[PDB]
């Protein structure tokens, strides 16, 4: 499923992401845009045998278990398949753990590179939330 911008903004708001760990809703919408282009089925293979899964590109070495990644820690205690669902819930609940790790949203490279320090509110503007 490829979300629309405002569709995803409303979903993320319902999931309690607005101001989660201090990050306003726009940060999360922007992160999803640059991480996955709003695509819930996005995947990216990495050189360590891990894969990044889903709308927020959560990694299989540290966060979810895909059964094929060396050194798997599975800190979110979830199968990576659950992160490819059309509903965002499993991704969001894992993202809540990730953003709580100690370095905020810096865990998401695409967010650091294209969202951090920008006018992130633009991503929810017009959405009638």
């Amino acid at each position: 499923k490829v979300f629309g911008r405002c569709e995803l903004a409303a979903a993320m708001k319902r999931h309690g992401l607005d101001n989660y760990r201090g990050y306003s809703l726009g940060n999360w919408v922007c992160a999803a845009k640059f991480e996955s282009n709003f695509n819930t089925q996005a995947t990216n293979r990495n050189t360590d045998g891990s894969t990044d899964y889903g709308i927020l590109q959560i990694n299989s070495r540290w966060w979810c278990n895909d059964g094929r990644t060396p050194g798997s820690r599975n800190l979110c205690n979830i199968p990576c398949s659950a992160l490819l669902s059309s509903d965002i819930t499993a991704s969001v609940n894992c993202a809540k753990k990730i953003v709580s790790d100690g370095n905020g949203m810096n865990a998401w490279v695409a967010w650091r590179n294209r969202c951090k320090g920008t006018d992130v509110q633009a991503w929810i503007r017009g959405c009638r939330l």
Epitope: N59, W62, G102, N103, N106, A107
Partner: nanobody, 126 residues
């Protein structure tokens, strides 16, 4: 790929100070942590001090807390280890490590979390 190069090191008197430097080059944009490890004679490598480059947050092994300070110059892709108040037990080969993955803090002092390594530099406390 990322190249790491250490400078500094050598002899120091107990109670004294030494500064180590680590310069990163190559695919430096994706660097997440720069971290100092060490390996004392006859012992396994251990993480000493980790720095998360996008916030400046730092993580230390218990045996060095308060004595060693890791810092960076992010714009120049540098990490520094200031070793103050050195002890006998600090004699070791010190190695810079880096990674381009967003490693959870709890695993930031584990060597298996790191992808790139310097050459090692000897520090000897007399």
């Amino acid at each position: 790929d990322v190249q790491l190069v250490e400078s500094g090191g050598g002899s120091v008197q107990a109670g004294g100070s030494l500064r180590l430097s680590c310069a990163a080059s190559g695919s430096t944009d994706s660097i997440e942590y720069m971290t100092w490890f060490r390996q004392a004679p006859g012992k396994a490598r251990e993480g000493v001090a980790a720095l998360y480059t996008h916030t400046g947050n730092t993580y230390y092994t218990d045996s060095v807390k308060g004595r060693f300070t890791i810092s960076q110059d992010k714009a120049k892709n540098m990490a520094y280890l200031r070793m103050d108040s050195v002890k006998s037990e600090d004699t070791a080969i010190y190695t810079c490590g880096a990674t381009r993955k967003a490693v959870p803090v709890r695993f930031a002092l584990d060597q298996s979390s790191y992808d790139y390594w310097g050459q090692g530099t000897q520090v000897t406390v007399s």
